[PDB]
Design a protein around this nucleic acid. Structure first.
Ligand code: K
Ligand code: K
Ligand code: K
Ligand code: MG
Ligand code: MG
Length: 51
RNA sequence: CGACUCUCGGCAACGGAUAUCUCGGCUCUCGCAUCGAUGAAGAACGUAGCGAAAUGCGAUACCUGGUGUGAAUUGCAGAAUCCGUGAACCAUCGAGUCUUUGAACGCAAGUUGCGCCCGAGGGGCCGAGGGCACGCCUGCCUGGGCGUCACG
């Protein structure tokens, strides 16, 4: 396919950027235990974000 | 005299009739002609400092932009703004955005399951982003058959 015009002309922007992936951290008592016991941060993340 | 039953009146209950209403209904008349593969109608999930629904909107998410008007919104709180490119849960619309779906279109489907191609940008690797259904029309490219021939 070598089209005579592009069907989409908008570049296409990454709407699932880092600010959508990392919404906010968890601050519950269980989540705070993970910080000093297992060097772990708990985050609320987007549903579309994989590991 | 007392209890019980029945009965008459006064006050208090129970219940929601009556009366007066009404941003609703019903009937009639008029004007207009505008949905969708440029993805509709419908369905799902999200979205507010405090929201569940209804209403609105779509990761730009009770809204962005333009224009108009011209000082509010308010249930609470905080911010912004005022002789101004300037408040508004204001009006209107030409600029935008518009998740998962659905005629629904890579293949499926009680699955966010199973594939292939291109590709900014940082040989290979990692990519943001995007393509790949069916029928049909015009043109085009690559082909098949001694089907009809011509010359070698
Ligand atoms: K009585
Ligand atoms: K009445
Ligand atoms: K399967
Ligand atoms: Mg509303
Ligand atoms: Mg489908």
């Amino acid at each position: 396919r070598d089209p005579k015009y592009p069907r989409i002309s908008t570049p296409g922007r990454n709407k699932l950027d880092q600010y959508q992936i990392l919404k906010y951290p968890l601050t519950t008592e269980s989540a705070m235990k993970k910080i000093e016991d297992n060097n772990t941060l708990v985050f609320i993340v987007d549903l579309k974000a994989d590991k």
